[PDB]
Amino acid sequence: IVGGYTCGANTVPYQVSLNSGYHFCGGSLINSQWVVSAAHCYKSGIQVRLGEDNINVVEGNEQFISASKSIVHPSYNSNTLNNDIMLIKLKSAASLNSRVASISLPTSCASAGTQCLISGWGNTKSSGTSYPDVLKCLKAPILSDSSCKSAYPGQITSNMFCAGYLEGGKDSCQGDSGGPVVCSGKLQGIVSWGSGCAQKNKPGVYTKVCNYVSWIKQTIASN
Ligand SMILES: [Ca+2]
């Protein structure tokens, strides 16, 4: 997250870290056994880390759980990042508490100008590299479809939306992928892609979770 702030330990209790001997992507806890993340984060060997704040120190309130199943959307296209969504089933159910809690899926899609919270352990620099230890937060609005398509002509599908700031300086970035975009207590986005980070007129692009609610619920009911 570039231009953001230190969230505060366990203030984003649904945020997870996906780990393979290092943090590589985020995700969101949507019930005691299931996490949503981005398809482009898919790997073998994933450990889900819940209740994290500093990803480099064991502080308390952490739960480390292996992934059992990792379900990439069948129509994921890795060249376009259309359908950039994955479900991950935990080996065991997490213990939910004030520090470790699920986020609700949307009933309706969000509209333009809705303010959301994006969070992650990704790069904090637009130009260069600097990974945080502790979780970073950014409040960003949903842009209009118009401004989103004018920023990325031909590359925005019905399953995406833009969020952020056209002036630059505030965005998600590498390592934030897969994490939450929460608006009025509902999971509306997943950190997906963009052109660089925090660059002017190139806002971040997010998977529009409201298009996937039926798919999420049908897949989970069968797995
Ligand atoms: Ca920790």
From Swiss-Prot:
Gene3D superfamilies: Trypsin-like serine proteases. It catalyses: Preferential cleavage: Arg-|-Xaa, Lys-|-Xaa. Its EC number is 3.4.21.4. Is inhibited by scorpion cyclotide trypsin inhibitor TopI1. GO terms for cellular component: extracellular space; serine protease inhibitor complex. It is found in: Secreted, Extracellular space. Keywords: Calcium, Digestion, Disulfide bond, Hydrolase, Metal-binding, Protease, Secreted, Serine protease, Signal, Zymogen. Subsequent cleavage after Lys-125 leads to alpha-trypsin. Further cleavage after Lys-170 yields pseudotrypsin. A cleavage may also occur after Arg-99. SUPFAM superfamilies: Trypsin-like serine proteases (SSF50494). Substrate binds at D171, S172, Q174, G175, S177. GO terms for biological process: digestion; proteolysis. Ca(2+) binds at E52, N54, V57, E62. Disulfide bonds join C7-C137, C25-C41, C109-C210, C116-C183, C148-C162, C173-C197. GO terms for molecular function: endopeptidase activity; metal ion binding; serine-type endopeptidase activity; serpin family protein binding. Binds 1 Ca(2+) ion per subunit. Belongs to the peptidase S1 family. This is Serine protease 1. It comes from Bos taurus (Bovine).
